[PDB]
Amino acid sequence: ADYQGKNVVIIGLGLTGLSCVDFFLARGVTPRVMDTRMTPPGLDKLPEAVERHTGSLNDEWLMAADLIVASPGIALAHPSLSAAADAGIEIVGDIELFCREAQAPIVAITGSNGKSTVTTLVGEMAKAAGVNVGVGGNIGLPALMLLDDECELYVLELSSFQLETTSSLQAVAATILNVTEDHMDRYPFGLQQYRAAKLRIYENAKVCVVNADDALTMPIRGADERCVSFGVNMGDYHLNHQQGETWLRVKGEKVLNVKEMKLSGQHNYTNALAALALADAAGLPRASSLKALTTFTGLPHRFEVVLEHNGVRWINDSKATNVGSTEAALNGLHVDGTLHLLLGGDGKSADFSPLARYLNGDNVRLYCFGRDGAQLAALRPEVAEQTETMEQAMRLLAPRVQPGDMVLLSPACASLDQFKNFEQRGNEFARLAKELGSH
Numbered sequence: 001a002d003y004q005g006k007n008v009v010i011i012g013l014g015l016t017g018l019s020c021v022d023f024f025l026a027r028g029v030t031p032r033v034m035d036t037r038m039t040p041p042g043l044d045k046l047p048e049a050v051e052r053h054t055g056s057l058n059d060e061w062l063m064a065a066d067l068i069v070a071s072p073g074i075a076l077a078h079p080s081l082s083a084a085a086d087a088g089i090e091i092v093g094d095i096e097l098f099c100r101e102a103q104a105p106i107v108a109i110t111g112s113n114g115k116s117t118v119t120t121l122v123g124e125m126a127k128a129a130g131v132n133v134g135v136g137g138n139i140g141l142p143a144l145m146l147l148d149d150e151c152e153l154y155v156l157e158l159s160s161f162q163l164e165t166t167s168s169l170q171a172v173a174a175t176i177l178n179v180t181e182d183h184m185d186r187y188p189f190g191l192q193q194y195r196a197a198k199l200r201i202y203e204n205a206k207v208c209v210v211n212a213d214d215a216l217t218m219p220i221r222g223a224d225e226r227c228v229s230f231g232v233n234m235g236d237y238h239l240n241h242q243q244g245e246t247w248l249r250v251k252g253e254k255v256l257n258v259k260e261m262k263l264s265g266q267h268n269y270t271n272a273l274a275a276l277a278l279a280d281a282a283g284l285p286r287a288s289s290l291k292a293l294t295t296f297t298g299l300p301h302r303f304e305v306v307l308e309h310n311g312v313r314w315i316n317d318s319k320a321t322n323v324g325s326t327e328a329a330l331n332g333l334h335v336d337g338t339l340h341l342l343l344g345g346d347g348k349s350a351d352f353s354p355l356a357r358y359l360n361g362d363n364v365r366l367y368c369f370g371r372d373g374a375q376l377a378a379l380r381p382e383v384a385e386q387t388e389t390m391e392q393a394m395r396l397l398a399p400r401v402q403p404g405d406m407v408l409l410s411p412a413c414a415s416l417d418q419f420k421n422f423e424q425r426g427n428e429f430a431r432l433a434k435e436l437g438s439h
């Protein structure tokens, strides 16, 4: 694409916005940047030559633009941005910019949960094959920072927000891993509107990898000739459950005994299937892909054991930012004593009620905090405490911890009401676990 002489406006002064500022400057275009936040995190990091506007969207700048580059954190439905669309002004996001420049095949991964795990797995499969791979997107490394004419494969984690503003993606292989309620504060037409954003990932994809156990991951015209499936008991890629042993299978053929994996849990085994399906579609050698499944140790903040000491496991599952991911932590969870469960933060208008079925019995205690703390405590008031902050919750629960207990941060919420990012929330939990979980 060519942006020469164009009036370019970037919305968002976070990680994405800063990456877009650098992208345009490097091609001889000086953009202007705005953010509705009064003091956005990227303000101090912005080059001094770049005009900025904070505290609102600037309608003079938007209506004057030739191109609006929207960070995923601003809604297209924002009245100012919607007005610009009505006027026919082109609106794209960083992923669109990336797709216009990328010169290697793209594997693209979305879904309500499991995205970073599958994304990282496909990256590891590529590395094991000796492929120069770039791994980025919603996982936390802005996609534009990956651009390299020597890159041989890109693996992108994509959010529904990024997909809304992307039109030029033609993935070699794309998946929606699952669709469960999230981001309802951004989707006033509910679950199907959210799903519709994710379904954009399949447009012009060479191969679509769908979840046989989740009908919402299928295109609305249904599965077509492009469409490879994974699942538990059914699918092209599926599991074989016999004698306390689990295997990954592809069309009836065993490919991996999951005892060789470092990850565990059924959802991680289906994550492995999806990763393998994507890698196969991208043409990566099967042998090295299977090897990568056995070397991968997991990601920080994803059911991460940060301390196992004095008979207590302290688990940082800070990446459980919606109900589906906390459900994945709780479903079939084994705890010898009491589960001390930390819930709270920005609930994004979620219905928390599906969690209630996991919170029965005499061995569960809830410690609820942050913006939507009260809504979480309401799941089962008789076993719940509410505090303002996670630290207060941790200091309240710690004296009650007994050998055999588990302390689990799996908050079912976003972190931005109180934290810089979910990593900061996880790191603060780990620091506090180390303090409070030792004599």
Ligand SMILES: CC(=O)N[C@H]1[C@@H](OP(=O)(O)OP(=O)(O)OC[C@H]2O[C@@H](n3ccc(=O)[nH]c3=O)[C@H](O)[C@@H]2O)O[C@H](CO)[C@@H](O)[C@@H]1O[C@H](C)C(=O)N[C@@H](C)C(=O)O
Residues within 6 Å of the ligand: 011, 012, 013, 014, 015, 016, 017, 034, 035, 036, 037, 071, 072, 073, 074, 137, 138, 139, 140, 141, 142, 143, 159, 160, 161, 321, 416
């Ligand atoms: C909200 C979102 O899409 N965040 C992703 C984004 O980070 P970045 O810092 O650029 O975000 P942003 O677009 O500046 O938005 C951050 C926050 O600022 C708010 N915001 C943003 C712009 C603005 O004008 N006004 C405003 O209030 C947003 O509502 C949001 O609460 O780009 C990064 C690189 O692609 C991602 O790693 C990061 O994923 C985070 C982990 C995330 O929470 N993603 C959501 C989608 C999710 O995983 O559920």
Ligand SMILES: Nc1ncnc2c1ncn2[C@@H]1O[C@H](COP(=O)(O)OP(=O)(O)O)[C@@H](O)[C@H]1O
Residues within 6 Å of the ligand: 111, 112, 113, 114, 115, 116, 117, 118, 139, 157, 177, 178, 267, 268, 270, 271, 301, 302, 303, 317, 318, 319, 320, 321, 324, 325, 326, 328, 329
């Ligand atoms: N297939 C799945 N279904 C539901 N939850 C999952 C799945 N895979 C992982 N999770 C849980 O979701 C959270 C984040 O998963 P992750 O791989 O980081 O993806 P995402 O990038 O979608 O948040 C973690 O708490 C993890 O335990």
